[PDB]
Design a protein around this motif. Structure first.
Motif, PDB file in Angstrom:
ATOM      1  N   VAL A 263      -3.540  14.508   0.355  1.00 49.92           N
ATOM      2  CA  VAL A 263      -4.062  13.315   1.023  1.00 49.92           C
ATOM      3  C   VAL A 263      -2.982  12.239   1.111  1.00 49.92           C
ATOM      4  O   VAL A 263      -2.781  11.605   2.150  1.00 49.92           O
ATOM      5  CB  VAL A 263      -5.304  12.761   0.281  1.00 49.92           C
ATOM      6  CG1 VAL A 263      -5.664  11.369   0.787  1.00 49.92           C
ATOM      7  CG2 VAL A 263      -6.492  13.722   0.428  1.00 49.92           C
ATOM      8  N   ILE A 264      -2.270  12.033   0.013  1.00 52.30           N
ATOM      9  CA  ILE A 264      -1.287  10.961  -0.026  1.00 52.30           C
ATOM     10  C   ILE A 264      -0.160  11.246   0.939  1.00 52.30           C
ATOM     11  O   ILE A 264       0.254  10.371   1.705  1.00 52.30           O
ATOM     12  CB  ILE A 264      -0.705  10.755  -1.439  1.00 52.30           C
ATOM     13  CG1 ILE A 264      -1.807  10.293  -2.401  1.00 52.30           C
ATOM     14  CG2 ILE A 264       0.385   9.713  -1.395  1.00 52.30           C
ATOM     15  CD1 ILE A 264      -1.441  10.439  -3.867  1.00 52.30           C
TER      16      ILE A 264
ATOM     17  N   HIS B 164       1.675   6.882  -6.770  1.00 55.70           N
ATOM     18  CA  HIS B 164       0.640   7.858  -7.081  1.00 55.70           C
ATOM     19  C   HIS B 164       1.193   9.261  -6.825  1.00 55.70           C
ATOM     20  O   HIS B 164       0.988  10.152  -7.641  1.00 55.70           O
ATOM     21  CB  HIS B 164      -0.629   7.597  -6.260  1.00 55.70           C
ATOM     22  CG  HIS B 164      -1.572   6.631  -6.901  1.00 55.70           C
ATOM     23  ND1 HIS B 164      -2.697   7.033  -7.592  1.00 55.70           N
ATOM     24  CD2 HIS B 164      -1.539   5.280  -6.992  1.00 55.70           C
ATOM     25  CE1 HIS B 164      -3.326   5.970  -8.065  1.00 55.70           C
ATOM     26  NE2 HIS B 164      -2.645   4.894  -7.714  1.00 55.70           N
TER      27      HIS B 164
ATOM     28  N   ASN C 244      -5.125  15.734  -4.055  1.00 59.34           N
ATOM     29  CA  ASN C 244      -4.761  14.323  -4.003  1.00 59.34           C
ATOM     30  C   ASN C 244      -3.371  14.139  -3.414  1.00 59.34           C
ATOM     31  O   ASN C 244      -3.135  13.206  -2.637  1.00 59.34           O
ATOM     32  CB  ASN C 244      -4.834  13.683  -5.393  1.00 59.34           C
ATOM     33  CG  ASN C 244      -6.246  13.295  -5.780  1.00 59.34           C
ATOM     34  OD1 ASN C 244      -7.048  14.144  -6.168  1.00 59.34           O
ATOM     35  ND2 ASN C 244      -6.559  12.005  -5.675  1.00 59.34           N
TER      36      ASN C 244
ATOM     37  N   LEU D 104       2.366   1.720  -3.424  1.00 60.70           N
ATOM     38  CA  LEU D 104       1.384   2.202  -4.395  1.00 60.70           C
ATOM     39  C   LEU D 104       1.071   3.681  -4.146  1.00 60.70           C
ATOM     40  O   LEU D 104       0.912   4.450  -5.089  1.00 60.70           O
ATOM     41  CB  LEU D 104       0.106   1.371  -4.354  1.00 60.70           C
ATOM     42  CG  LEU D 104      -0.902   1.626  -5.484  1.00 60.70           C
ATOM     43  CD1 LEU D 104      -0.278   1.400  -6.847  1.00 60.70           C
ATOM     44  CD2 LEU D 104      -2.132   0.753  -5.328  1.00 60.70           C
ATOM     45  N   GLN D 105       0.986   4.079  -2.879  1.00 61.96           N
ATOM     46  CA  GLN D 105       0.773   5.488  -2.540  1.00 61.96           C
ATOM     47  C   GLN D 105       1.918   6.365  -3.052  1.00 61.96           C
ATOM     48  O   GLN D 105       1.684   7.431  -3.611  1.00 61.96           O
ATOM     49  CB  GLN D 105       0.604   5.661  -1.024  1.00 61.96           C
ATOM     50  CG  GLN D 105      -0.736   5.165  -0.489  1.00 61.96           C
ATOM     51  CD  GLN D 105      -0.807   5.173   1.034  1.00 61.96           C
ATOM     52  OE1 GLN D 105       0.141   4.767   1.709  1.00 61.96           O
ATOM     53  NE2 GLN D 105      -1.933   5.640   1.579  1.00 61.96           N
TER      54      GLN D 105
ATOM     55  N   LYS E  61       0.839  -1.199   0.000  1.00 67.76           N
ATOM     56  CA  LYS E  61       0.000   0.000   0.000  1.00 67.76           C
ATOM     57  C   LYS E  61       0.870   1.244   0.000  1.00 67.76           C
ATOM     58  O   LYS E  61       0.589   2.199  -0.719  1.00 67.76           O
ATOM     59  CB  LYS E  61      -0.943   0.031   1.205  1.00 67.76           C
ATOM     60  CG  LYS E  61      -1.949   1.180   1.153  1.00 67.76           C
ATOM     61  CD  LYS E  61      -2.943   1.150   2.317  1.00 67.76           C
ATOM     62  CE  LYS E  61      -2.256   1.416   3.651  1.00 67.76           C
ATOM     63  NZ  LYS E  61      -3.217   1.476   4.785  1.00 67.76           N
TER      64      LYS E  61
END
Ligand SMILES: O=C(O)c1ccc(COc2cccc(Cl)c2Cl)o1
Length: 114
Positions: A77-78, A11, A74, A7-8, A4
């Motif tokens: 947030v990440i 992004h 976005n 993947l974050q 996770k």
């Protein structure tokens, strides 16, 4: 779980690259003006906790993209979810060097999770 995390970060990387690619081109008339603004750079950026230095510059980053005319939301947030009192380098950078710096950081952490 580190899946996770990776993947974050991917992004994050892609979002920062989209911004850089978006501003750093000759189809952008405001580039010269955008490069006059000063961004503060992390004294050290080797661990996820160092993303605090990024978070604290997201508002100005947003403002400069603003005054030159969301991904930022976005990114915010990440960064919050991936993420220590931030230490900054003594010399400031342009928006382009700032982005390139956090792109390299992102790529670096990603590789240490392979
Ligand atoms: O809502 C967002 O902006 C948000 C939440 C997590 C992330 C980071 O990207 C991810 C990371 C991990 C998994 C997934 Cl499916 C995504 Cl899309 O962005």
């Amino acid at each position: 779980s580190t899946k996770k995390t990776q993947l974050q970060l991917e992004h994050l990387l892609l979002d920062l690259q989209m911004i850089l690619n978006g501003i750093n081109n000759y189809k952008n008339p405001k580039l010269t003006r955008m490069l006059t603004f000063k961004f503060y750079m992390p004294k050290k950026a080797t661990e996820l906790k160092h993303l605090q230095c990024l978070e604290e510059e997201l508002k100005p980053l947003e403002e400069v993209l603003n005054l030159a005319q969301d991904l930022i939301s976005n990114i915010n947030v990440i960064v919050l979810e991936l993420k220590f009192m931030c230490e900054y380098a003594d010399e400031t950078a342009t928006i382009v060097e700032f982005l390139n710096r956090w792109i390299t950081f992102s790529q670096s952490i990603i590789s240490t999770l392979t």
